[PDB]
With several copies, the nearest count.
Chain A
């Protein structure tokens, strides 16, 4: 029940915003407020040709 990393730093008032490769998630949106997504970042599969 303790957040680390980006969400941990932002939730505990240690920072104002978290700029980076932050995937917007349901728990993350519940805990902190996210902005409008500026790029699509889904989950995908990488395989050898």
Chain B
């Protein structure tokens, strides 16, 4: 009689999250970051102009 009931299954390696220094900058593309940065300055100048 069996002394341990079990079955075949799959083992895989857990990909641990490796956070880069730019992860929080991932949601916005670099070109969008530059464009919004330029937009901030152009709006700032046009207000007092």
Contact = CB atoms under 8 A, between A and B. Distances in A.
Direct contact of A and B (CB under 8 A): yes
Interface of A: 24, 37, 40
Closest 4 CB pairs of A and B: A40-B5, A37-B2, A24-B1, A37-B1
Contacts of A37: 1-2
Interface of B: 1-2, 5
The majority secondary structure among interface residues of chain B is loop
Contacts of A24: 1
4 contacts: A24-B1, A37-B1, A37-B2, A40-B5
Nearest to A34: B1
Nearest to B5: A40
Nearest to B6: A40
A48 to B, nearest CB: 28
Contacts of A40: 5
B9 to A, nearest CB: 15
